[PDB]
Design a binder for this molecule. Structure first.
Ligand SMILES: O=C(NS(=O)(=O)c1ccc(NCCSc2ccccc2)c([N+](=O)[O-])c1)c1ccc(-c2ccc3sc(CCc4ccccc4)nc3c2)cc1
Length: 181
């Protein structure tokens, strides 16, 4: 008997990773062929879920916790001889005190920095690794958690764009009340 999980989480590591990379100037990728059509009106077009949410939180994280993050990225020096263990360790402590969206996003970034550091050392080859190491920890040290707090749907409904605006809707309203009161 055996069993596994989904892949969504993994998609986050890739999508985000790329973002953290592009933000630094890097990128790298490839193309291919499949099969599809279209006939309406092409344009940027954007979503409004984990993708957008995750990113934002990431940028704001290093902003509010510029030090809390920096000091972290300096706690682990990824290398070819580095063992996935040395990784799951550092991330463990930062996650020792229970689990909360905050630490979650604050964590994701940790990895992003690792990649930025790898490329800086002309070792982008690592990116692929750290990327897999995350999807492994997120599915063995978070999955069970994220599924106990309403998955991501909740994270995007709390500390997310559509959510941010939603919050204001109320406030701007409440204030109007006391005023008319
Ligand atoms: O912010 C946090 N929590 S929150 O109140 O739930 C929150 C606060 C703000 C936001 N968003 C607004 C932007 S700020 C932000 C901050 C964090 C995440 C996302 C956003 C969000 N959120 O979006 O989910 C959540 C938060 C922020 C930082 C840390 C944090 C920082 C450094 C370290 S170093 C360490 C172990 C050391 C150690 C290292 C190695 C080896 C051994 C020991 N553990 C750490 C934990 C822990 C929690």
């Amino acid at each position: 008997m055996s069993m596994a999980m989904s892949q969504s989480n993994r998609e986050l590591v890739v999508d985000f990773l790329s973002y953290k990379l592009s933000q630094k100037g890097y990128s790298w990728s490839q193309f291919s062929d499949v099969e599809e059509n279209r006939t309406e009106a092409p344009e940027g077009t954007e979503s409004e879920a984990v993708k957008q949410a995750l990113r934002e939180a990431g940028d704001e994280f290093e902003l509010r916790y510029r030090r809390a993050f920096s000091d972290l990225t300096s706690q682990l020096h990824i290398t070819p001889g580095t063992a996935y263990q040395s990784f799951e360790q550092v991330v463990n402590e930062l996650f020792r005190d229970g689990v909360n969206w905050g630490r979650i996003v604050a964590f994701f970034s940790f990895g992003g920095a690792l990649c930025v550091e790898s490329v800086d050392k002309e070792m982008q080859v690592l990116v692929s690794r750290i990327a897999a190491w995350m999807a492994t920890y997120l599915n063995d040290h978070l999955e069970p958690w994220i599924q106990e707090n309403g998955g991501w749907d909740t994270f995007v409904e709390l500390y997310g764009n559509n959510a941010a605006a939603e919050s204001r809707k109320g406030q701007e309203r409440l204030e109007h009340h006391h005023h008319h009161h």
